Every structure is written in structure tokens, then in C-alpha cells.
Amino acid sequence: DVQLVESGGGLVQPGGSRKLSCSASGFAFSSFGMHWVRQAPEKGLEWVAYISSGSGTIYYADTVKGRFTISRDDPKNTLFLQMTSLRSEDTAMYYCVRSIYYYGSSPFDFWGQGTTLTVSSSDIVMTQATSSVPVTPGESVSISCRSSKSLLHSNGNTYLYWFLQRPGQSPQLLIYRMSNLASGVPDRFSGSGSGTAFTLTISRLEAEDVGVYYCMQHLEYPLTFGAGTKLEL
Amino acid sequence: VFGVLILTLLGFLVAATFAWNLLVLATILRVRTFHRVPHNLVASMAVSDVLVAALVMPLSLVHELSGRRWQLGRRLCQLWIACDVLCCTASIWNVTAIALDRYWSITRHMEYTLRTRKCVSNVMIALTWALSAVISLAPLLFGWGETYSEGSEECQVSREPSYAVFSTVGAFYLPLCVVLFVYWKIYKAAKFRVGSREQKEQRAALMVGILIGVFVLCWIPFFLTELISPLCSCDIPAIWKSIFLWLGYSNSFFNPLIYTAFNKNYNSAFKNFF
Amino acid sequence: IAQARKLVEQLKMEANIDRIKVSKAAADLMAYCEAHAKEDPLLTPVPASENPFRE
Amino acid sequence: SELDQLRQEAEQLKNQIRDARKACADATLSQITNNIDPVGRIQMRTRRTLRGHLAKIYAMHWGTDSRLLVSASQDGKLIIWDSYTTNKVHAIPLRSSWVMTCAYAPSGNYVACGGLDNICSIYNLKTREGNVRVSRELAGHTGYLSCCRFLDDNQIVTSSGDTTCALWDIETGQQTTTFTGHTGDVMSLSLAPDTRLFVSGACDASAKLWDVREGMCRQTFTGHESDINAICFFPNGNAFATGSDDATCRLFDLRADQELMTYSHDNIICGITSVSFSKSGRLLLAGYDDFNCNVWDALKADRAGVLAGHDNRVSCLGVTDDGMAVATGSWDSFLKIWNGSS
Amino acid sequence: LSAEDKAAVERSKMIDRNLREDGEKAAREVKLLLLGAGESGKNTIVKQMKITGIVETHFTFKDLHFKMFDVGAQRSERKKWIHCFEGVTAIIFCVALSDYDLVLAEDEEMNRMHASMKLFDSICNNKWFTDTSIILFLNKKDLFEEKIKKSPLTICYPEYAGSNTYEEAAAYIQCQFEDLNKRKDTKEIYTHFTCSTDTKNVQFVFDAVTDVIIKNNLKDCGLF
Ligand SMILES: NCCc1c[nH]c2ccc(C(N)=O)cc12
């Protein structure tokens, strides 16, 4: 089955360097572009770097530009992130995310477990309505979010993505493009929005639905993740 | 002196050239079926003929209408000389490149595949144009005698023997020998292949012979005269020079006839257009 | 003679269909075409704004 | 003799059916549509030019979304094009390059293709892995496949060169039904809009309307001279058009049980390669072997326009489910989408 | 264009590059048709080269690769699918010399040799193969020689001179088969007698392909 296994991390002296290596199996690695997403301790998701299929295009975040470099080795189905001048703020759990781009595609469909990294001792802004809300089984909830810039492109596609993170687990894609449910996701979830205001509704809440919900925009790089909303039982 | 008849024939030749060369170029550029490697050399040759008929031949006819005198601009006389030399060398070396491509395809079909053929043909065309430009622009920087000192009363190519021999060797003699060798090899290979029909051998021999004879008759006299003159006190008369120059020009008219009239694709496209 | 038996059976079965007069079928086809002509982009070209295949 | 009696009975039945068809022909379509307003000169332009195929393109099909297109060529690659942005979506390497037909599932999840290999290969386009792989190989046909059409995500009807058609269950890969009765090679298929009926044209110069559930030939239609290459249902579903090597098209009505209109011109002496209607059915677009396609007035049989932009014969024709544009594929390995202008 | 649109464009460019590479790779392979009747001793020929539906056999010679398509098992009207092979470099036809006295199974008087001649005429005088060359193979040399020693060739060729000898009969058969070529000016037939030496047959096929390629190139130059 599809699987991503990250390796590298642990303790690193400030200003040091190390190469994080992710191994992909169960799918055609060469056909998928790759992203690195880091989540700081008790913080939201943050995009780090992106490398397209064939290494034809590479992008970095301004906080990452120059300091970290991303590469891929297709024959061995491996992804590498060489990090140098590691600042104290770089401590986080890093996940490797696959993404496939074509008409009707659902990028960010799979997320790796990721690895921990710790140290010794101009863009679209996404915001969410509330940090947490109460929940009970069988109830209906509606999380809301907004973006500084309208995500409705001239082509007619609204580039909004909803991700759900379980406690002690990596995030998973729920809805892509604000109107398409991710494959395998239960039909309970339903995303909607207009221009700049978006909402994810759950028809009937289940015990498993509790978790941290994140919103992402793919209109233009860097990819910004809004503050997570904690859905607590 | 049959001036009216000569002028009418020369104008008809100019019109026929211009029309046929432009038609060939339009057929290449318009019909997608002709977008193939072997047709790039033909397109370059057609472009050279179009330049000859548009820039060289009319100015040469105008100059000859007054005899050996020149009344045009000072810089325009150098421009005309450079254009004439460049276009003639480009046409000659384009014919040489076409012959070389045919020889490579016939003899090295295994190693001369489309991948190699495209690069080889493009390099040949580029080298042809570069060498023609170099030979045309050399007299402007080396030698003397470009124009008469009597108020630019005359307009002619540099007569320096040292430059003349080099230009003649690079422009015609070396490509002439290359063409002769490659076409002899092609004829031998074709005869061997047919031997392994009579109408067939006759067709191949007639094609090779007519091509070589047209090339020789059109070019060899003019280049021989131009090489002989600087070293001679012979002092060949101007009438022979004009006749040989206009034969070299008529090589431009004959080239499309040889390379497109007898080609199946070219004549079929012409008939379809008509 | 099995093939002949099958052929005759198929012919007898097919000949019993309640075929409709050609005039009536043509009338209904014409009515349907007239009704649905308004919704034909090819028959009635749509404005360039509504045409996805813009130049 | 029993054989003589059976032959006489068959001849009598043929006489009876032809007499009934003559009797029910109280009028003709030409007289009724004589006073209809002529469509006029239909002008279309090539909005998009899809290139990338390195060999003859033999079949193509439009998706239900009216945006994605599928094309098959003898080169060995099956290409899914994004018509709106002329962007390639998938390039499936075919095990056998001798493919003559292709199909696109109504839901777009599966793509079926076949040809001289006598095997219909079904490819899943929405697997978890980001590559297209064969999901099933329907084998059993004694001849080359000619047409493929998806009834649903699990049922597929295919016609082969063995003069028989077959309805297959994709999940099991077993021929659920076999349709027999055609004395010649079957060349094309066309599902009815209701999806319950279909009609198949054969090289015996005849078309046969079958029943999917009952696995039986409900009707037969004749009138062509040499060979039927293409067939298509009229949008209303009660009629279908047939193109033949006779260089003429014929419209048949199931209820009338006889030919309705004939489309022909002295300027065309080549057979019909493909046929398709517009959404309203007023325009009948037929591809011709003379390097161009023609548009006929389905009601008046007037040549409304000509779509001539292919250097070779038009091998496949298709109209989007919404009728916005019409795509044509020819042996020169170029697919062109044509649309009208105000 | 959006980021997703740019990624889709990049994917399309990658697909186009892969298609171009595959086309360049495939352009180096010689495509040959294979046809015959009565099995035409065809199994021996195919296994020599190698050492339902179409069967594709790939074999590499000293310096060239060859793809051979066996479509003889299709058993359907050639008119509807023969045109698919318009681009084949050459057509290999196989004939069993023993068919002269053999009677076709589907018939009771027509000889298998007559059916083979009819098939050869149909394939050769085809609008799709006017400029395509034919390589003719005569397989059953030994069995034909054994048969002619007792059965006269007049059983199949009443017009034959009646000379009961191997060499004259073989020459007559080859001449009769070659006479069917009504487009000699546009195509040629490379007849050959099959032998137990596989390398000889492969070398003959390679030489025929090389001759065809050379003639096609020369015709491209216009000398033909
Ligand atoms: N019109 C002839 C131009 C030309 C081409 N090649 C040449 C080579 C030498 C000379 C010369 N006048 O010496 C002239 C030419």
C-alpha cells in the first residue's frame, strides 16, 4: 500500500546541518511531486519546500529559502531535505506529503508520519473563526475560515484544502478545491465557500471526528496553513 | 546589337526565377507534409535564389544597361557586391550540401538516421551561410578595387589576386570537387543497386548527368574567367565576363527546375495548387 | 436446416412488430428537432463569452 | 422437402415485411420537411489543435463532463487530453499497438480499448497509485474488435470481427450475453440514450437493433449497398444514422422500421468513416475519406457546411455531450476541435 | 495560470517528452508483415527468425532490429484491417512448394497452390502496398523435390512444359509467382528458397531489408 517513511532528526546543535531522508513505497514516486510540511510543538502546520516531478520546479518558503535545499532520487524512490544553519525556531515534526497535479487530481492526498527535530541549549493569510468548539456524538458542527485574498481563480476553481489531524497522527486530506470530497473520506463532511469565506460542515458528528482541522490555500506559493481548530468531544 | 530581345529575355528570366523560387518557398512553409529534414536544404536554396532574383539580378541588369559605368551610391555598390558574392556562394554551397546529404543517406543510411540527419543538415546550412557571408565580407576588409576612384564610376568585386584565388577556391572549386565525388559515388551505388533494369539505369544516369552538366556549364566558365583575369595580362573582354556572370545567375533559375520539377512531392504540390 | 429454422423464426418474430406510419414518425422527429433546436450550440453559435473554447 | 419449405417460408416472410413497410410508408420525410427553414451555411473553426500522436489516430471518445477527451493511435499510446487547455492528462502505454477502437466510461473511471489483438483492455484511471494499469482483459472474441461502449462501470458491450457482439460483466470478465445474427463483420456500435437498446452495423450492408436484457435481435434494417462503417443513434432515441462505403448516409427509424432519408452528393465518391449528430439532432456530421468532414441537414439533407482541415482521411468524429464543440481525428495524427461563431 | 495549472502544464510537457523519446526509440525498428496459407511452413520461418489475434515477434540481427507481425490467425476480411499495415517496410510471404498437388481442405478440386497464388495476387496488387516490397519464401524444398520425383507438375500447371525436374520446376514456380507483380516499376520481389541453415534465411532477410531501404532513400533523392 501507499506509504511514506521519514528518517533523520533528533538533537542538533544550533547552526548545525543534517539531511532528512524520506522513503516512498507502494506508488510511482517519479509521478508525484513532493512537499515538506513542518509542525512546531503545539503549533499549526507550515509549508517548507516543494519539488515537482522530475525536479523541474523547486520552491521554498522565505523562512526556508537558501538555508534548506530539497532534492529527489527517483530510481531509489527517495526524497532529501538538506538543512543548514538550523535556527532554534526550526525545531518541529516534519512530514513528507505527496501531490499529483492534473485535471480532477487531489493533491496532498497522503501524508507521511514524519520525524522530530529539536535543538540543544506578501502572501495570502488564512484565519479560522475559533481555536476550539464543543462536540457531542450525533451533533452538527460548522468550522469557518477566511483568506486575505480571494481564492476563486478566473478558471472557476477555488483552491481551498481541508485537513484533519488526529491526536498523535499526521494530517489527512478531507476536501480539495472546496467542493470535492477526498477519496475514502466518509460522506459526513461537506465543504463550501464563496470567494474569501469558507466553511466545513459535518452532517452528524462521530466520536472519531474529533481532531485538529486546518485550512490551506493553493492559489499561489508559499502555501499558508491557517491556525488549527481543535474539535474536542 | 539585339538589345531589345536580350532585355526581354533577361526580364523573363528574372520573373521566372522570382516566381518559381517564391512558389517553392511558399510550398515548403505552407504544406505541413514538407516539414521534414531533407526539405530544409531545399528551403535554404530557394531562399538563396529568391535573394539572387530580388537583390542581385535586378541591380546587375540596371548596371549593365549603361554598360560598364556605375551611377549608384557609394555604399550601395559595396552592398550590391557583398550581396552578390554572399548569395552566389550560398547557392553553390547549398547545392553541395544537398549532394552531401544525398550521399550520406545513400551510403550511411544506418548511421545517417533522422536524429543524425537533422543535426547534420542544420550544421551544413549554418556553415554554408557563414562561409558565404565570410567570403562576401572579406573583400570589404581586404584587397582593393571595389569601386572606381573616378567618382565611383565603376562597381566590381575586388581584383586582388591573393584574395581572388582564395575566394575562388573556397566558393566553387572545393564544393565543385566535393559535388563531383559524392555524385560519382551516388551514381556507382545506384548502378550497383539496380544491377542487383534498363529504363531504371537510364533514368538514374540521365538525372546525374543533367545535374552535373547544368552545374558545370553554368558555373565553371565564370569562375575560371574570374580566377584567370587577375593573373592574366590576357585581359578577357567584358562581354564574355557579362555572359559568364549571367550564366552563373541562370544557375539560380535552373536549380529549382533540377531540384523540384522532377521531384514527386514538389510537382504534385504544384499541380494541386494550380 | 437449423440455420434455416432460426432464420424463419427470427423473421416471423420481427414481422409482428407494430410499426408506425412513416409520416407520424417524421412528424414527431420534426417536432423534437424544432423543440430542441434552441439548445444546440452548433446550430446556433453561442457568444464568445459562453464558449469555453476561446482563442 | 423440409429445406425447400423453410426457404419458401423465409421468402414469404421477407415479402410480407417488405409489403408492410411499403404500406406504412404513407409519406416521406422530404415532403414534410420541404417547408422547414433551411439551416444555412454552417461555418466552424478549429479552436484547438491537439498534437502528440506519432501515428494514425483510429478512435476517440468524449467524456461525460464534455471537457476530457480520449484518443487511441497505432503508435501504441492512448492519450487523455484536456480539451479546454489542450493539456495532456494521461499517456497509457498499450500492450498491443494494433488498436482500432477506444471508449470512455460515463463516470470517467475506466477506459476501454481494443483492436486486432481480439482482447478488450480496461484501464482504471482513478487508482490510489498515480499510474494507469490494466484492470481487466476481456478475451473470447474470435475476431478483431471494432467498437467499444460502456453501459456502466461494470457492464461493457463490444463488437468484434466474428460477426457477433457481446455484453461483458467487467468484474467477472465473462460474456454475460452474446448477440448473433449478423452474416458479416460488425463495424460499429451505438448505445441508445435509454441505455437499454443498441444497434450494430455490419459489413453485410445491414444494421440490427438488439435488446440488451433479452439478448435478442429486435429489428433489422437494410438499404446500404456495400458496407456500413459507422452508426449513431439520433438524440431522441427512436432513429439512427448509418454511414457506408457507398458514399451515402441513411437515416432509419425504429418505429417506422424502414429508411427515412438518404444523404448523398455527386461530389463525394468515398465511403463514410464516422457519423454523429448534434445535441438537437438537426445537424448530421459525417466524416469522409476525402480528407474532410461534412455536415448535413438531418431534416432537409442539405449540405450545410464542410469541416476540411485534415491532411488525411477523417478516421473518427465525436460531439461533446453538451454539443458545445465537435472533435475530429484523422490518420495524420492530429486531433482538431471545431466550434462555431456568432 | 495558477500553481496547479502550471504543474499540469509541466506534467503535460513531461508526457510529451516521454512520447517523443518512445517515438524515437520505435523509429529504429523495422516492421515486416507475415502472410501465408496452409501454414506455409510458417512455424519454421518464425522460429528461425526468433533464434488469438496478431502475434508479434522481435528479433535482433547483427546490427538491426526486426518486428514481425503474424496476422494470419486473424481469419477475417482483410479489407477492413489490412490498411493498418500501410507503413510496413516489407511483406514476407510464405508458400509451401508441396501445395501444387495438394487439394484445399475447404474445397475438393481447387489446389492449395491456386489459393496461394490468389492470395499473393490479392496482397501484391493492393492499393495499400503499391510501393511496399515483398520477400517470397519457398519452404518445402525437400518435400517438393520428393513429390515431383513421382507426381508431375502438370497436375497443377497444365500449361507447364512438362519437364519433370527439380530445377526447371522451381524456376517455373518462381517465374509464375513473380509474374503476378503488376506494379514491377514500383515494387520488387525477393524470392528465396528456405534451407535448414537459419543464418542463411536471416541474412537474406537482412539483405532484402537493406536493399529496400537503399532503394527508398535513392528514390527520395529523386534518382528513381
Ligand atoms: N557573382 C559571382 C559572385 C561570386 C561568388 N563567388 C565568387 C568568387 C570570386 C569572385 C571574384 N570576382 O573574384 C566572385 C564570386
Numbering used by the authors:
A (entry chain E): 1 to 121, 136 to 247
B (entry chain R): 38 to 233, 276 to 353
C (entry chain C): 9 to 63
D (entry chain B): 2 to 343
E (entry chain A): 5 to 55, 182 to 354
Sentences reproduced from the published study:
5-hydroxytryptamine receptor 5A (5-HT5A) belongs to the 5-HT receptor family and signals through the Gi/o protein. It is involved in nervous system regulation and an attractive target for the treatment of psychosis, depression, schizophrenia, and neuropathic pain. Thus, 5-HT5A stands out as the only 5-HT5 subtype expressed in human brain regions, including the cerebral cortex, hippocampus, and raphe nuclei. 5-Carboxamidotryptamine (5-CT) is a synthetic agonist for 5-HT5A and also activates other Gi/o-coupled 5-HT receptors with distinct affinities.
In this paper, we report a 3.1 Å-resolution cryo-EM structure of the 5-HT5A–Gi complex bound to a synthetic agonist, 5-CT, which is also the first 5-CT-bound 5-HT receptor structure. The 5-HT5A–Gi complex was assembled by co-expressing the engineered receptor with Gαi1(4DN), Gβ1, Gγ2 subunits, and scFv16 in High Five (Hi5) cells in the presence of 5-CT. The high-quality density maps are clear for modeling 5-HT5A from residue 31 to residue 353, with the exception of residues 237–275 in the intracellular loop 3 (ICL3). 5-CT is embedded deep into the pocket constituted by TM3, ECL2, and TM5–TM7 of 5-HT5A. Its indole scaffold is anchored through a salt bridge between its positively charged nitrogen at the 3-aminoethyl group and the carboxylate of D1213.32. On the other side, the nitrogen at the 5-carboxamide of 5-CT forms a hydrogen bond with the side chain of E3056.55. Besides polar interactions, the indole scaffold of 5-CT tightly packs against a hydrophobic cleft comprising side chains of V1223.33, F3016.51, F3026.52, and L3247.39. Similar to agonists bound to other Gi/o-coupled 5-HT receptors, 5-CT directly contacts the toggle switch residue W6.48 of 5-HT5A and triggers its rotameric switch. The cytoplasmic receptor cavity constituted by TM3, TM5, TM6, and the TM7–helix 8 junction accommodates the distal C-terminal end of the α5 helix of the Gαi subunit, forming a primary interface.
